Write a protein that holds these residues in place. Structure first.
Motif, PDB file in Angstrom:
ATOM      1  N   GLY A 168       0.951  -1.327  -0.059  1.00  0.00           N
ATOM      2  CA  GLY A 168      -0.048   0.064  -0.067  1.00  0.00           C
ATOM      3  C   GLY A 168       0.771   1.420   0.035  1.00  0.00           C
ATOM      4  N   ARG A 169       0.531   2.092  -0.615  1.00  0.00           N
ATOM      5  CA  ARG A 169       1.115   3.682  -0.831  1.00  0.00           C
ATOM      6  C   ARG A 169       0.294   4.344  -1.922  1.00  0.00           C
ATOM      7  NH1 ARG A 169       4.114  -0.382  -1.962  1.00  0.00           N
ATOM      8  NH2 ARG A 169       4.497  -1.277  -4.287  1.00  0.00           N
ATOM      9  N   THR A 170       0.775   5.752  -1.739  1.00  0.00           N
ATOM     10  CA  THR A 170       0.122   6.764  -2.546  1.00  0.00           C
ATOM     11  C   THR A 170       0.629   6.862  -4.081  1.00  0.00           C
ATOM     12  OG1 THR A 170      -0.357   8.156  -0.437  1.00  0.00           O
ATOM     13  CG2 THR A 170      -0.462   9.274  -2.696  1.00  0.00           C
ATOM     14  N   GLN A 171      -0.108   7.291  -5.047  1.00  0.00           N
ATOM     15  CA  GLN A 171       0.354   7.177  -6.411  1.00  0.00           C
ATOM     16  C   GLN A 171       1.504   8.005  -6.620  1.00  0.00           C
ATOM     17  OE1 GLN A 171      -3.204   5.817  -5.246  1.00  0.00           O
ATOM     18  NE2 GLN A 171      -3.707   7.803  -6.159  1.00  0.00           N
ATOM     19  N   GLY A 172       2.519   7.676  -6.777  1.00  0.00           N
ATOM     20  CA  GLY A 172       3.863   8.322  -6.992  1.00  0.00           C
ATOM     21  C   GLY A 172       4.892   7.829  -6.433  1.00  0.00           C
ATOM     22  N   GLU A 173       4.781   7.277  -5.329  1.00  0.00           N
ATOM     23  CA  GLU A 173       6.071   6.684  -4.592  1.00  0.00           C
ATOM     24  C   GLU A 173       6.260   5.295  -5.047  1.00  0.00           C
ATOM     25  OE1 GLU A 173       4.796   7.012  -0.544  1.00  0.00           O
ATOM     26  OE2 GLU A 173       4.422   9.322  -0.594  1.00  0.00           O
ATOM     27  N   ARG A 174       7.129   4.775  -4.445  1.00  0.00           N
ATOM     28  CA  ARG A 174       7.562   3.271  -4.660  1.00  0.00           C
ATOM     29  C   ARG A 174       7.845   2.419  -3.523  1.00  0.00           C
ATOM     30  NH1 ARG A 174      12.412   2.357  -8.821  1.00  0.00           N
ATOM     31  NH2 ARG A 174      13.580   4.029  -7.645  1.00  0.00           N
ATOM     32  N   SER A 175       8.010   1.328  -3.591  1.00  0.00           N
ATOM     33  CA  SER A 175       8.135   0.463  -2.343  1.00  0.00           C
ATOM     34  C   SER A 175       9.771   0.125  -2.139  1.00  0.00           C
ATOM     35  CB  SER A 175       7.592  -0.681  -2.655  1.00  0.00           C
ATOM     36  OG  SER A 175       7.689  -1.806  -1.545  1.00  0.00           O
ATOM     37  N   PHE A 176      10.449  -0.670  -2.957  1.00  0.00           N
ATOM     38  CA  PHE A 176      11.893  -0.811  -2.480  1.00  0.00           C
ATOM     39  C   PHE A 176      12.680  -1.035  -3.988  1.00  0.00           C
ATOM     40  CE2 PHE A 176       9.862  -2.336   1.106  1.00  0.00           C
ATOM     41  CZ  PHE A 176      10.679  -1.706   2.163  1.00  0.00           C
ATOM     42  N   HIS A 177      13.708  -0.490  -4.197  1.00  0.00           N
ATOM     43  CA  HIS A 177      14.348  -0.603  -5.529  1.00  0.00           C
ATOM     44  C   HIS A 177      14.875  -1.969  -5.994  1.00  0.00           C
ATOM     45  CE1 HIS A 177      14.648   3.530  -5.078  1.00  0.00           C
ATOM     46  NE2 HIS A 177      15.918   3.733  -4.733  1.00  0.00           N
ATOM     47  N   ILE A 178      15.147  -3.037  -5.032  1.00  0.00           N
ATOM     48  CA  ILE A 178      15.471  -4.358  -5.580  1.00  0.00           C
ATOM     49  C   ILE A 178      14.769  -4.832  -6.399  1.00  0.00           C
ATOM     50  CG2 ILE A 178      14.303  -5.293  -3.625  1.00  0.00           C
ATOM     51  CD1 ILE A 178      17.818  -6.138  -5.065  1.00  0.00           C
ATOM     52  N   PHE A 179      13.086  -4.677  -6.356  1.00  0.00           N
ATOM     53  CA  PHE A 179      12.135  -5.110  -7.088  1.00  0.00           C
ATOM     54  C   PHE A 179      12.521  -4.702  -8.486  1.00  0.00           C
ATOM     55  CE2 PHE A 179      10.836  -5.920  -2.925  1.00  0.00           C
ATOM     56  CZ  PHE A 179      10.324  -7.185  -2.906  1.00  0.00           C
ATOM     57  N   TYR A 180      12.169  -3.195  -8.443  1.00  0.00           N
ATOM     58  CA  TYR A 180      12.154  -2.512  -9.887  1.00  0.00           C
ATOM     59  C   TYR A 180      13.535  -2.622 -10.749  1.00  0.00           C
ATOM     60  CZ  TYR A 180       8.320  -0.151  -7.438  1.00  0.00           C
ATOM     61  OH  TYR A 180       7.285   0.065  -6.896  1.00  0.00           O
ATOM     62  N   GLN A 181      14.548  -2.907 -10.067  1.00  0.00           N
ATOM     63  CA  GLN A 181      15.885  -2.911 -10.600  1.00  0.00           C
ATOM     64  C   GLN A 181      16.121  -4.255 -11.246  1.00  0.00           C
ATOM     65  OE1 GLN A 181      18.673  -2.203  -7.522  1.00  0.00           O
ATOM     66  NE2 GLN A 181      18.489  -0.138  -7.333  1.00  0.00           N
ATOM     67  N   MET A 182      15.033  -5.180 -10.934  1.00  0.00           N
ATOM     68  CA  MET A 182      14.882  -6.538 -11.548  1.00  0.00           C
ATOM     69  C   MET A 182      14.392  -6.592 -12.862  1.00  0.00           C
ATOM     70  SD  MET A 182      13.480 -10.243  -9.972  1.00  0.00           S
ATOM     71  CE  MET A 182      13.180 -11.518 -11.101  1.00  0.00           C
ATOM     72  N   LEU A 183      13.127  -6.317 -12.889  1.00  0.00           N
ATOM     73  CA  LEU A 183      12.125  -6.155 -14.064  1.00  0.00           C
ATOM     74  C   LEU A 183      12.769  -5.684 -15.043  1.00  0.00           C
ATOM     75  CD1 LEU A 183      10.197  -6.836 -11.666  1.00  0.00           C
ATOM     76  CD2 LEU A 183       8.545  -5.191 -12.427  1.00  0.00           C
ATOM     77  N   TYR A 209      15.109   8.241   9.048  1.00  0.00           N
ATOM     78  CA  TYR A 209      14.177   9.011   8.174  1.00  0.00           C
ATOM     79  C   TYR A 209      13.662  10.241   8.841  1.00  0.00           C
ATOM     80  CZ  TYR A 209      11.498   5.599  10.849  1.00  0.00           C
ATOM     81  OH  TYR A 209      10.799   4.617  11.975  1.00  0.00           O
ATOM     82  N   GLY A 210      13.481  11.322   8.128  1.00  0.00           N
ATOM     83  CA  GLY A 210      13.163  12.565   8.832  1.00  0.00           C
ATOM     84  C   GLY A 210      11.558  12.906   8.900  1.00  0.00           C
ATOM     85  N   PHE A 211      11.404  14.190   9.348  1.00  0.00           N
ATOM     86  CA  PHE A 211      10.104  14.533   9.328  1.00  0.00           C
ATOM     87  C   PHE A 211       9.305  15.039   8.023  1.00  0.00           C
ATOM     88  CE2 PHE A 211       7.142  18.454   9.321  1.00  0.00           C
ATOM     89  CZ  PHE A 211       6.067  17.956  10.039  1.00  0.00           C
ATOM     90  N   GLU A 212       7.964  14.717   7.834  1.00  0.00           N
ATOM     91  CA  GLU A 212       7.406  14.656   6.493  1.00  0.00           C
ATOM     92  C   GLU A 212       5.795  14.974   6.676  1.00  0.00           C
ATOM     93  OE1 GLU A 212       8.089  11.371   4.436  1.00  0.00           O
ATOM     94  OE2 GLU A 212       6.921   9.873   5.778  1.00  0.00           O
ATOM     95  N   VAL A 213       5.157  15.879   5.864  1.00  0.00           N
ATOM     96  CA  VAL A 213       4.059  16.237   6.056  1.00  0.00           C
ATOM     97  C   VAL A 213       3.300  15.931   4.505  1.00  0.00           C
ATOM     98  CG1 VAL A 213       2.021  17.910   6.016  1.00  0.00           C
ATOM     99  CG2 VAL A 213       3.584  17.370   8.049  1.00  0.00           C
ATOM    100  N   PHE A 214       2.386  15.358   4.270  1.00  0.00           N
ATOM    101  CA  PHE A 214       1.654  15.136   2.921  1.00  0.00           C
ATOM    102  C   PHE A 214       0.172  15.704   3.061  1.00  0.00           C
ATOM    103  CE2 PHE A 214       4.672  11.564   3.253  1.00  0.00           C
ATOM    104  CZ  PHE A 214       5.232  11.621   2.116  1.00  0.00           C
ATOM    105  N   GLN A 215      -0.426  15.702   1.752  1.00  0.00           N
ATOM    106  CA  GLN A 215      -1.689  16.279   1.600  1.00  0.00           C
ATOM    107  C   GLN A 215      -2.798  15.646   2.671  1.00  0.00           C
ATOM    108  OE1 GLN A 215      -3.434  19.215   0.290  1.00  0.00           O
ATOM    109  NE2 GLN A 215      -2.002  18.634  -1.461  1.00  0.00           N
ATOM    110  N   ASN A 216      -2.465  14.308   2.803  1.00  0.00           N
ATOM    111  CA  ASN A 216      -3.360  13.442   3.661  1.00  0.00           C
ATOM    112  C   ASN A 216      -2.601  12.757   4.633  1.00  0.00           C
ATOM    113  OD1 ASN A 216      -6.552  12.694   3.983  1.00  0.00           O
ATOM    114  ND2 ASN A 216      -5.220  11.278   4.744  1.00  0.00           N
ATOM    115  N   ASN A 217      -2.711  12.836   5.789  1.00  0.00           N
ATOM    116  CA  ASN A 217      -1.934  11.953   6.840  1.00  0.00           C
ATOM    117  C   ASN A 217      -2.687  10.442   7.084  1.00  0.00           C
ATOM    118  OD1 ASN A 217       0.116  14.177   6.897  1.00  0.00           O
ATOM    119  ND2 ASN A 217      -1.192  14.906   8.459  1.00  0.00           N
TER     120      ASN A 217
END
Ligand SMILES: Nc1ncnc2c1ncn2[C@@H]1O[C@H](COP(=O)(O)OP(=O)(O)O)[C@@H](O)[C@H]1O
Ligand SMILES: [Ca+2]
Lengths: 68, 464, 375, 68
Positions: B74-89, B271-279
Motif C-alpha cells: 500500500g502507498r500513494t500514487q507516485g511513491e515506490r516500495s523498494f528498489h531491489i524489485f524495480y531494478q530486476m524487472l 528517516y526525517g519529518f514529513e507532511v503530505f496532503q493527507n496523513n
C-alpha cells in the motif's frame, strides 16, 4: 539354533510378502477412493455455484414481485 | 576522524577510498524516493566504526530495524516500495522473464497493482540498471550471484500472482477458499519446490495441536476471505523482513573486514519529518519516533549531562527545567496506555479500526496532547478523523488500516511448511531460529516494532 | 526483562489441562487430569511409590494405577490431591516457577462461592503468585473468533453452557448448566457394550473408550432412516483392531451413545434436547434481539468436532422456529481450542490490569478481595 | 550354515520392518481419505436437497409473479 533361524526365516519371508501385498492393496484402495473424492469435490463446487444463482434468481423474483 | 588518527595505514586508508565509492552504491539498496526527498532511507540505521588499540579505523558493521510495514502493498500514487524489485524487472532479458511467467510491466501483476502507481517521473529505472550492475560487481556480486538473487524476488512475484477467487462453495455468509487460476498458483509451488497440494491444504487450512510431544497437523476447516487475504499478506511481509536482514548481512561477508579486530564507535541515521496532503497511520508511527528521538536528546544533552556535573564533584543545584514529558511515554508503554490499549483492541478480531478510535477519545481527551470533534468544539476536525497534538504542531490522522497493517502476525502452521524445505534458498529466508533476538516468539509483529525501537534506545543511553 | 514479562495461559477442565509458555496461540503443555495410587504397592522399595503417577507419565502406564478422579464436571471430590496436580503443570512441563510469572485460569459460570477463596488461597496464601485472574470460559472464544453479535454454546467435556453473549455480560441470565457432556458419554458406552460381550469396567480401561471414540464414533444423520439401512454392512460396521488384542466391528454402537445428547431420557432427566433449552433461554430476552441471534450461532468445544453435529441442528431448529432470517452455524477451524485462542489474548493484553488481582490488593481487602473485585 | 542363515535373517527382518512401515502409512492414508470422502458425500447430499429447494422456490416465485 539353525532350525530356529530357518523357522524365523520362513515366517519372516512369508510375512514380508504379506506386508508388501497389503501395502499394494492399501495403496490400490487409496487410489480408487482418492479419484472418487476428487470427482465429488469438483461436483460439489459446481452445484454450489448453481446454488448461488438459484437463490439470487429467487430473490430477484421476490424483489421484482414487490414492485408489481 | 581521519588524519587525527595519525594518517598512514594501508588497511585504514582503504576504507576511506571504498566509503567514497559507497555513494553510488548505498543509494541502490536502502533508499527510495519520497515526494519530499529523493535519497530517503526507508530503514533505521546504526553504523558502527571499528578501531584498534591505537586509534586508527579497521572496519565496521551495520544494524537495521523493523522498518515500515505496509510499504510493500500500500502507498500513494507516485511513491515506490523498494528498489531491489524495480531494478530486476528492467534488468533480466524478456526471455528469462517469460520463462518465469513474467513481463516488463508491473500493472500486469496484482500485488504491484494494489500499490496504485508504477512509473515515476523523476527516476529512470531502465537506464539505471546497467549502471547498477557495475556497482553490483564493485562489491562482489557477479552475474552468477545476480541470478541467484533474482530467484528470491521471482519467488515473491510468484506469490504476487496468487489471489483467491472467492470460492462460492458456501451459499451465504462465510466462504471457503479455492484457486481457479491454478497456473499462477502452480508456478509458485514449482519454484518454491514444494508439494502444490500440501501447500494449498496447509495454508488455506491452519493446523494446531502442538502438545509438547510436538504437534499433529491437518485438522482444520475453511474460513472467511478477509482472514485468508490477511494471512496471505503476513507471509509476504515476514518473508521480505527476514530477507533484507539476511541479504545485507551476506553482502558484508564480502565487504566487512576480517583481517583486524577491536572496539566500536557508533553512528545514527534515520528517516526525517514529513507532511503530505493527507496523513494516515504511517505518519503516526513516524512522528512517534520523533517524539522518542526528541526524548533521546533531552535524556542525553539535557539530563545525562546534568548528572555528570554532580558526579564530577561540582556544587550543582537542580535548576528549573521544562516538564520531563514522561507522560507521553508512559501513556504508551506500561499497562493502561495508547499502544497498550491498542494491543487490546487488535486481538479482538471484531474490534475494527473505527471501534479502536472510539476507545482513544473516551479513555483520553483528558490527558494532555489530544483533541477531536466531540470534545474540542472545532469543525476543522472531521467525524472520520481526529486531532493529535505533538510537541508543538498539530496533525490530523486517518484510521485506515491501523490494525491489519500493524499486526502482521504469522504463526507456525503457515511458517512450518516453509521451514522444513530442502531448497537452500527457501530455508535461507528462515534462519536456524532467532538470531540474537530470542525472548518470547509469538506476540504479533506490531508489538515487536515497539520492542525493536526500545532495544534501540536502551543501547543509546549506555554510551557517550 | 526489557520488553518481556511472560504470562502463563492455562485452561483446565474435566478432560485436559491446556497450558503454554507465553503469548502463545495454541496450548503447548497438555495432560490428563488424573491422580491415583498403587493398588499394586510400587515394589514400594523400587521407588517409595508416592507420585500417584500423573502427566504424560500416568496415562502412559495406566493398568497398574488406581486412577481416582477429583474434578467430576464442577464438584471437586477432594482438594488435597489438586495440590499435586498443579505440581505437575508449572514444574514438569512448563519448567517455570509460579513465584515468577502471573497466571490465568478459567471460570465455570455459577461456581460455588467456597471454591473462589479456596483456589485463590492455594496460590497467594501458600505458593506466592504475584498476580492472577480467572476469566469466564465462553466469553473468551467470542473475541478470538471475531464475533460481536452471537449466541455461544461452549461445551468441551465438563458441562454445557448456553451463553447468549453478543454485546455484554451480567444480565438476567439466559444461561444454563447441564451435566451432560464428554465423560458422560464415556461411562455410557460400557453400559451398552455389555449386550455384546464387552465390559470396560474400571477407570483404567474406561480411558481407552475415549481413544476408540475419537476415531470412528459418529452421529447418525437420522436414526429413523438409518434403521432400515442397518441391513447394509458398508456404512455401519467399521473394523477397529484394538491395539491391545480384540476386534470390535462397531456398527450400531457409534451413534447410540451420542444420542443421549439429544435424548436426556436415556439418563433419567425431564430435561429436553439442547435445541429446546435454546428456545427457553432466548425467549426470556428482548423481542427485537432474536433476529440477529439465529443469523449467527457460535458452536465451540470438542463436542462440535463429531461428524454430523452442525447439519442436524439446521434441520430441527428451522422446523419449529422463526423462519425469516438466514440460518447459519459457525464452526471455526479448531472450534475446540477456540477457548485457548481467546485465552491467550486476555493474558497478553495490558488493559487486563484493571481487572486482575495484585499481591497487595489481597491484603487490603482480606480474603473477600475476590468477590469485591470480580463477580 | 547357521552364520549364513543369521545373515539372511538380519536383512530379512530389515526388509520386513520397511514393508510393514510402508503398509502402515498406506493404510492410514487410505483411512483419512475414506473419512474425507464420506464427509464430502454427506455434504453433497445435504446440498443436493438445498439445490433443488433453491430451484423450486425460484420457479414458485416466478409463478407467483405471473399471477400478480
Ligand atoms: N476431532 C475430534 N473429534 C471428536 N472429539 C474430539 C476431537 N478432538 C478432541 N475431541 C474430544 O474432546 C474432548 C476434549 O475437549 P476439551 O474442549 O479440551 O474438553 P475440556 O475442556 O472439558 O477438558 C476429549 O473428550 C476429546 O476426545
Ligand atoms: Ca471448551
Amino acid at each position: 539354533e539353525l532350525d530356529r533361524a530357518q523357522e524365523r526365516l520362513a515366517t519372516a519371508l512369508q510375512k514380508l510378502e504379506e506386508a508388501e501385498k497389503a501395502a499394494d492393496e492399501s495403496e490400490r484402495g487409496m487410489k480408487v477412493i482418492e479419484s472418487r473424492a476428487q470427482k465429488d469435490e469438483e461436483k460439489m463446487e459446481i452445484q454450489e455455484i448453481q446454488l448461488k444463482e438459484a437463490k439470487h434468481i429467487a430473490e430477484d423474483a421476490d424483489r421484482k414481485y414487490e414492485e408489481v | 576522524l581521519t588524519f587525527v588518527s595519525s594518517n598512514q595505514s594501508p588497511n585504514g586508508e582503504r576504507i576511506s577510498k571504498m566509503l567514497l565509492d559507497s555513494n553510488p552504491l548505498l543509494e541502490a539498496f536502502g533508499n527510495a524516493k519520497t515526494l519530499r526527498n529523493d535519497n530517503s532511507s526507508r530503514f533505521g540505521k546504526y553504523m558502527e566504526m571499528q578501531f584498534n588499540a591505537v586509534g586508527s579505523p579497521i572496519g565496521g558493521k551495520i544494524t537495521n530495524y523493523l522498518l515500515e510495514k505496509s510499504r510493500v502493498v500500500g502507498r500513494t500514487q507516485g511513491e515506490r516500495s523498494f528498489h531491489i524489485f524495480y531494478q530486476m524487472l528492467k534488468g533480466l532479458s524478456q526471455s528469462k522473464l517469460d520463462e518465469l511467467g513474467l513481463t516488463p510491466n508491473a500493472p500486469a501483476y496484482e500485488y504491484l497493482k494494489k500499490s496504485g502507481c508504477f512509473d515515476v517521473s523523476t527516476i529512470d529505472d531502465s537506464g539505471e540498471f546497467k549502471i547498477i550492475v557495475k556497482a553490483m560487481e564493485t562489491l562482489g556480486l557477479k552475474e552468477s550471484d545476480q541470478n541467484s538473487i533474482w530467484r528470491i524476488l521471482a519467488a515473491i512475484l510468484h506469490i504476487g500472482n496468487i489471489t483467491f477467487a472467492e470460492a462460492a462453495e458456501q451459499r451465504t455468509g462465510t466462504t471457503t477458499v479455492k484457486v481457479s487460476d491454478t497456473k499462477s498458483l502452480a508456478a509458485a509451488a514449482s519454484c518454491l519446490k514444494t508439494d502444490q497440494q500440501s501447500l494449498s491444504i496447509a495454508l488455506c487450512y491452519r493446523s494446531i495441536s502442538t502438545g509438547v510431544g510436538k504437534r499433529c497437523e491437518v485438522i482444520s476447516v475453511p474460513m472467511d476471505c478477509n482472514q485468508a487475504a490477511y494471512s496471505r499478506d503476513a507471509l509476504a511481509k515476514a518473508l521480505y523482513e527476514r530477507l533484507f536482514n539476511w541479504l545485507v548481512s551476506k553482502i558484508n561477508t564480502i565487504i566487512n573486514c576480517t583481517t583486524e579486530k577491536g572496539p566500536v564507535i557508533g553512528i545514527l541515521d534515520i528517516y526525517g519529518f514529513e507532511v503530505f496532503q493527507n496523513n494516515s497511520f504511517e505518519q503516526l508511527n513516524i512522528n512517534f519516533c520523533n517524539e522518542k528521538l526528541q526524548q533521546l536528546f533531552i535524556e542525553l544533552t539535557l539530563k545525562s549531562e546534568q548528572e555528570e556535573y554532580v558526579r564530577e564533584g561540582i556544587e550543582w543545584k537542580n535548576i528549573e527545567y521544562f516538564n520531563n514529558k514522561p507522560i507521553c511515554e508512559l501513556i504508551e508503554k506500561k499497562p493502561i496506555g495508547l499502544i497498550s490499549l491498542l494491543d487490546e483492541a487488535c486481538l479482538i478480531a471484531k474490534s475494527t479500526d473505527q471501534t479502536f478510535l472510539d476507545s482513544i477519545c473516551k479513555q483520553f481527551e483528558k490527558n494532555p496532547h489530544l483533541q477531536s470533534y466531540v470534545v474540542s468544539k472545532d469543525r476543522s476536525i472531521g467525524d472520520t478523523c481526529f486531532r493529535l497534538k505533538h510537541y508543538a504542531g498539530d496533525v490530523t490522522y486517518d484510521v485506515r488500516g491501523f490494525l491489519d497493517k500493524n499486526k502482521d502476525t504469522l504463526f507456525g502452521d503457515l511458517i512450518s511448511s516453509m521451514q522444513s524445505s530442502s531448497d537452500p534458498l527457501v530455508q535461507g529466508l528462515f534462519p536456524p531460529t532467532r538470531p540474537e533476538d530470542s525472548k518470547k516468539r509469538p506476540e504479533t509483529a506490531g508489538s515487536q516494532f515497539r520492542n525493536a525501537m526500545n532495544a534501540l534506545i536502551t543501547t543509546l543511553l549506555a554510551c557517550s | 526483562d526489557e520488553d518481556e514479562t511472560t504470562a502463563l495461559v492455562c485452561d483446565n477442565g474435566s478432560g485436559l489441562v491446556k497450558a503454554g509458555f507465553a503469548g502463545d496461540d495454541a496450548p503447548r503443555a497438555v495432560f490428563p487430569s488424573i491422580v491415583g495410587r498403587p493398588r499394586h504397592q510400587g515394589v514400594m522399595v523400587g521407588m517409595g511409590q508416592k507420585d500417584s503417577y500423573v502427566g504424560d507419565e500416568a496415562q502412559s502406564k495406566r493398568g497398574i494405577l488406581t486412577l481416582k478422579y477429583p474434578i467430576e464436571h464442577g464438584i471437586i471430590t477432594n482438594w488435597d490431591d489438586m495440590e499435586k496436580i498443579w505440581h505437575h503443570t508449572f514444574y514438569n512441563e512448563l519448567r517455570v516457577a509460579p513465584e515468577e510469572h502471573p497466571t490465568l485460569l478459567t471460570e465455570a459460570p455459577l461456581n460455588p462461592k467456597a471454591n473462589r477463596e479456596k483456589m485463590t488461597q492455594i496460590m497467594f496464601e501458600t505458593f506466592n503468585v504475584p498476580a492472577m485472574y480467572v476469566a469466564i470460559q465462553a466469553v473468551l472464544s467470542l473475541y478470538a473468533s471475531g464475533r460481536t453479535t452471537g449466541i455461544v454454546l461452549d461445551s468441551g467435556d465438563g458441562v454445557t453452557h448456553n451463553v447468549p453473549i453478543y454485546e455484554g455480560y451480567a444480565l438476567p441470565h439466559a444461561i444454563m448448566r447441564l451435566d451432560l457432556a464428554g465423560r458422560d458419554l464415556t461411562d455410557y458406552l460400557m453400559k451398552i457394550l455389555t449386550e455384546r460381550g464387552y465390559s470396560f469396567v474400571t477407570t483404567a480401561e474406561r480411558e481407552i473408550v475415549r481413544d476408540i471414540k475419537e476415531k470412528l464414533c459418529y452421529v447418525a444423520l437420522d436414526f429413523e432412516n438409518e434403521m432400515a439401512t442397518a441391513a447394509s454392512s458398508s456404512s455401519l460396521e467399521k473394523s477397529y483392531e484394538l491395539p491391545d488384542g480384540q476386534v470390535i466391528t462397531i456398527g450400531n454402537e457409534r451413534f447410540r451413545c451420542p444420542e443421549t445428547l439429544f435424548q436426556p431420557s436415556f439418563i433419567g432427566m425431564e430435561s429436553a434436547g439442547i435445541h429446546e433449552t435454546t428456545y427457553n433461554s432466548i425467549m426470556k430476552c428482548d423481542i427485537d434481539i432474536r433476529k440477529d441471534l439465529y443469523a449467527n450461532n457460535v458452536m465451540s468445544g470438542g463436542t462440535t468436532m463429531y461428524p454430523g453435529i452442525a447439519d442436524r441442528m439446521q434441520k430441527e431448529i428451522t422446523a419449529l422456529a422463526p423462519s425469516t432470517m438466514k440460518i447459519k452455524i459457525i464452526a471455526p477451524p479448531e472450534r475446540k481450542y477456540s477457548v485457548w485462542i481467546g485465552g491467550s489474548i486476555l493474558a497478553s493484553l495490558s488493559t487486563f490490569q484493571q481487572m486482575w488481582i495484585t499481591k497487595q490488593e489481597y491484603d487490603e481487602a482480606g480474603p473477600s478481595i475476590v468477590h469485591r473485585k470480580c463477580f
